[PDB]
Amino acid sequence: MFENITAAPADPILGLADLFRADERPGKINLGIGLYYDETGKIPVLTSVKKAEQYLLENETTKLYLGIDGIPEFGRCTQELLFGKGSALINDKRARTAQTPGGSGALRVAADFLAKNTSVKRVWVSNPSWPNHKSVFNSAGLEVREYAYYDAENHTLDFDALINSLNEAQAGDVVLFHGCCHNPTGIDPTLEQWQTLAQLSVEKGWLPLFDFAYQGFARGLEEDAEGLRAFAAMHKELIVASSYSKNFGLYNERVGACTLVAADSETVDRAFSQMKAAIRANYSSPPAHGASVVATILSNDALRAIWEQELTDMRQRIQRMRQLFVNTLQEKGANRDFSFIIKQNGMFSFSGLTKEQVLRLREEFGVYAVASGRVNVAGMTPDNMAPLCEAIVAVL
Amino acid sequence: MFENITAAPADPILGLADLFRADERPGKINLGIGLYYDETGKIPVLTSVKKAEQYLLENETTKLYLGIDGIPEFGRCTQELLFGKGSALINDKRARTAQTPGGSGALRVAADFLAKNTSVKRVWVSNPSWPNHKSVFNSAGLEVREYAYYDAENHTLDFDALINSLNEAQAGDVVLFHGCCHNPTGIDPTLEQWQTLAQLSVEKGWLPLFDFAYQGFARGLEEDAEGLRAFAAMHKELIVASSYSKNFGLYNERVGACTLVAADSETVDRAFSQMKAAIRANYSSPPAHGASVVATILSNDALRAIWEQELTDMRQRIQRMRQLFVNTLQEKGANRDFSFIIKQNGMFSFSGLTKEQVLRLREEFGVYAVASGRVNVAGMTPDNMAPLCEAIVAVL
């Protein structure tokens, strides 16, 4: 039965991890996958989390199945984070949230729900986009088309080219937007540009789907939610696929949420019941650990305070590494001007390196980046910065 | 977009929990969902688990994403429990295992992989069956057909009808078997019947898929694996979806696995690359907590000792409630003879109650069972036995 199966290619990002874990080279540097590293070169568990965990160990009395949609309080917390202190979506009970295995799982859940209960046939994604967007969508039988976004010659968001691209998208089509910290470009719309896209998508008849995995890494919690919040004032319906993997450093526990919004309560209720059905046919109910962590923290004043501080610390360390990256490239004798990099946000930097440069940086110097030229700034340190910068320079 | 969505009917099993939750009549009894309860009527966290968790709290230094297939240890251990200590399957490197979110998740992963990579078009499940098998397979776009199994009148496995019904299975069809503790009948084939079924399947050209979620609740860890092991000696290819929800009381941490077997290392290798691709398009990588707990316990001699004993205690307590249940029915007024109940394995009893009978027990007396008349023996206690036996009696 399997005699004929054909070997699949590997995950361009996660597969890189195996490549990495196999060199026996001494000074290998991982600028691959989007993990937050500290000054000392490690991927720590946050303190607020360890604290939360201790609380769980002592107070949990059962491992009882959660309801298909997970922990209710986790749902509440997600919504305020998402929409605001006393938003009307919340007040009007227009939103329903299901806890899922990561934002990756929320993506799959939204896709299955769409493909089965609606007339959606296509999903529009940005070019360039996060590689897994295509796999998830195609999997549900949906078609993936791309819209113009990044201005390569000028390292900017090419608005009208974006806008002209989307003019080809039909009413009833799905349009996928990254909430903040566009992966992999780092370039986000202005609040103004967001307001425009919101007005337009209402006129054009598009269903918006937000992939929000980076809340708090751009400018802050509440401010990173502006675009989304702007869409939300205009729209009757929308979907949010959010992740707590990065802002809580809880990568392997898979904590995320799928938030569904409709014009009103009665409608969201009916719609949500079909979402739950798509869950039931998938993993049944979500993993408790990571999400209980998150609700515990969000729910406790003290813990919350410590957590926000850790988040702000993470963001600042990255802002610093970015300034230090360009300076040293400079001082190390690079050909190009790399200052645009200072203008990107989030963990990465869409560096402008070619496929073969990235390939070379790796065979030859043990530095690991994604083929697209995406480099993990959060994996940079004062101690690895020089060697790193030399490698790049050597390849340009 | 969501205007015309029809509300979906709730999960027959998990939906009962909700109702259960909203019932406020004082002495309600839950014999619905398959959770293990104790003498005092609690769903406790195992002692071996609490220990392993303390261990993790103190020794974990990172939440780094696991690989698509999970923790290697977890895989290795799973295959031993499965195929036994020094099996050829393991020695010949013919099996690959992926850690998944529960056995539910393993069922979905198998489905997507088969649907996308072979000519499989139909899955055969038993009558009666576990409600979720249908949902998962259909979602992957596979046809679900039923095979005869239980003899209502004599409360036993009807081998003939079993065999006669499968005659229509075509070569290349998938046949799904429950490893031990048939849910919901509680009737399992004998070793010799297993030996027979394994001969056919090879002759007839079927791909077997084992749903193995109750290892250790019938007779013991190794005894419970006999049927599967008998199949494994004949077959070249096999699929196993197992779970640790029940044998570890880890219901909400979603711990399970999907094991793929091929005639050879190279073949299983290529085949599993496609399984990984199906995961990638789903939830990406699995939740660490629960599975780390399992690997911890299985890889430590003393924790493993405490664990095996806890499992033996659970099994024993159930067998005790089983006899007490029949005894009390009889001694309380029953018309029927419920003695056949003693011959079933696992947590439940296919009591022979009517749909209207169960609706009534719920409505009138606050007792909760599953519509098919399946009752959770593991939810029974010396203190609730009386009132429950009376409820039943009153509806006969």
Ligand SMILES: *Cc1c(COP(=O)(O)O)cnc(C)c1O
């Ligand atoms: C990380 C991230 C996700 C979600 O990842 P999970 O670990 O599955 O939560 C989704 N989209 C983008 C662009 C991401 O970077």
Ligand SMILES: *Cc1c(COP(=O)(O)O)cnc(C)c1O
């Ligand atoms: C419990 C069970 C499963 C798996 O349940 P999970 O909690 O998802 O691991 C699968 N099949 C049957 C018949 C079960 O009883």
Ligand SMILES: O=C(O)CCc1ccccc1
């Ligand atoms: O590096 C990233 O882009 C974020 C981490 C990630 C990678 C691949 C699948 C999901 C999450």
Ligand SMILES: O=C(O)CCc1ccccc1
């Ligand atoms: O009670 C059962 O049959 C086991 C628990 C369960 C219930 C519903 C979906 C997945 C698992």
